[model samples]
Structure formats: C-alpha cells, structure tokens
Target chain A: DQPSVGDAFDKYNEAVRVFTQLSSAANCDWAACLSSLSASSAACIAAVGELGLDVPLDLACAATATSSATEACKGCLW
Target chain B: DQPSVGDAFDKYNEAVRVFTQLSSAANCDWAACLSSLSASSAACIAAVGELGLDVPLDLACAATATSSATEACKGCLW
Candidate 1:
C-alpha cells in the first residue's frame, strides 16, 4: 500500500503544476521544463518496472499523449 | 492560489490515480473513467474560459496529449 503506483505520480503531478504555471509568455527555462517531464516519464517507467509490472497500456499511452499535448502547448507559446 | 489553474487539475489527477489503480486486468466501469476525464476536461476548459484568458498554450496542448494517451492506454486492457 505504501508503495502504491498512485504515489509514484505525485512528483509527476507536481512537475505538471510547475510547468503549467511557468507558462507566462516568455520567461521560463524551457529546457528544464522539458527535462523534468522526461525525467518524470523515465521515473514512471522505472516505477512500473520495479513493481515487476508492464506499464499499463493506459498509463503508457497516456504518457505519450500528455507529452504530445505538452509539445503542442509549447508550440503555442510564441 | 486557491483559484489557481493547478487547482483545476486536482480532480483530473485524482481521476488518473483511480483509473490507474483500477487497472488490474479488466473490470473498471470504463465509461466512467472516460466520463470523469471528459468532465475534468470540460471543467478545465470552462475554468479557463471563465477567466477570459486563452487557455495557456501549454495547458491546451497538454490536455489533448493526455487525452490521446488515455485513449491509447484504454486500448490495452484486454
């Protein structure tokens, strides 16, 4: 229970919060934002791996989807 | 900060948590998850709309990306 997958996403959630807020026009360290997301992605993949489970198809696909949306959003920041 | 956009994602994040945990093989009310997601999606969109500010490009794109990933993930629960 302590090691639930839900907990794994806490950090990822925080990352999302930070990235979304740092979005006021042009003043963020973009590379850092992207890097954090990549890091979260890897961390999640690792968490599932350590749990000896395949990334749930939902989680797996959702990860990619979110990343794509993030890219799309970034594109709009001009 | 109480009305921060980050607050808007809280339910969405929780929905993600519930959906992921309920992913043990097959039995979730799949429609509910999707519905909840849709609800959250609408809620966020509405929240942004209420502010009279354009949905941040990052947020707008991220929303679509996550949705796509969700669709992909749902495809795997067989």
Candidate 2:
C-alpha cells in the first residue's frame, strides 16, 4: 500500500511503483499505474536478487501468516 | 522458463525476458539473469495485481502443503 510496511515492504513498493510509472510513461496514461508502486519493491527485488529468488521470501511469509488457507489448514505437530 | 505456460505466463515471460535483456545489455553479462524468469511469474503477478493482492492464493497452497512450519503447527479445523 505504502512505504510504511517496514524495510522489506518499503523496497517492494518502490519496484512496483517504478514499473507502474514506466508503464504510465510509455502509454502516456495515468489511469493505470504499474511503474508507480513503492520504493520498497525495487529495494526488495535488489536485495532478493543478491540472494537468488524466484519470488521474495516475504511473499511466503505473508502467505502463511495471514491467508485464509493458513487459517483453514488442519495440521498437527505430532 | 519460456512463454508456454499460458496467456498469463506468456506475458510474464515477456517481462522477465525484458528485464534480463536489460541487465545483459547493461553489463554484457549472460550468466546472471533476473529478468529472464518464466513468463508464469509475471502473468501470475499481473493477474493478482489487477485483482489486488496481499499474497498469491497459490503460495498459501504450497506453504500449507509443505514447509516445516506446517509440519510443526499444532491445530484443528472445527
């Protein structure tokens, strides 16, 4: 949403914004934005890039921490 | 890794290819690729983005399916 999400999310936002802004500039349209995400997007991408990634580890974090699937899962530590 | 996954994957691949090409063009390096991922990643990202996303629904799928987190969780479905 915004860069207040923390360091990782902040960087993620930037990448999204950059891509959104680039899209808008190329199309000369403001209705749709891809290059205008947040700074965090680029930062996170660069950080993850340094580590090798198909997707950010943060995504996995968010997926498991708050998703309905996580809430609905039935499992045990046995 | 190519554009054969689907319409979504096709587009995703294009984005990745563009980025990879950009990286290559900038440094003349062919070994490291950030932009040359499978098209599915971009397609998936776009699809989710247009629909609005906190995280991919599929990620939750994988996380709940495997991972030590799932294996270690102690829970019950009502």
B12-42: candidate 2 lDDT, tens digit per residue: 2233323322332344332212111111133
For residues A1-78, what per-residue lDDT tens digits would candidate 2 score against the true structure?
A: 121112222233233323322322333322112111110133212322322121232122222221101111212100
Residue B58 C-alpha lDDT in model 1 = 22
Residues B1-78 of candidate 1 have per-residue lDDT tens digits of: 123223433434444434343442333322322322222343333322222112332222222222222333344211
Cand. 1 Cα-lDDT: 0.30
- Estimate the Cα RMSD of every predicted model relative to the unseen true structure: 10.4, 17.9
For model 2, report DockQ.
Answer: 0.04
Instruction: Give the best candidate by TM-score.
Output: 1
Report the C-alpha displacement of residue A48, candidate 1, in angstroms. 16
TM-score to true structure, per model: 0.33, 0.20
Evaluate residue A53 in candidate 1 and report its C-alpha lDDT on the 0 to 100 scale.
20
Per-residue lDDT for B76 in model 2? 14
Error of 1 at B68 (Å): 14
Worst 10 residues of 1 chain B by lDDT: B47-56
Question: What ranges in model 2 sit over 4 Å off?
Answer: A1-78, B1-5, B30-78
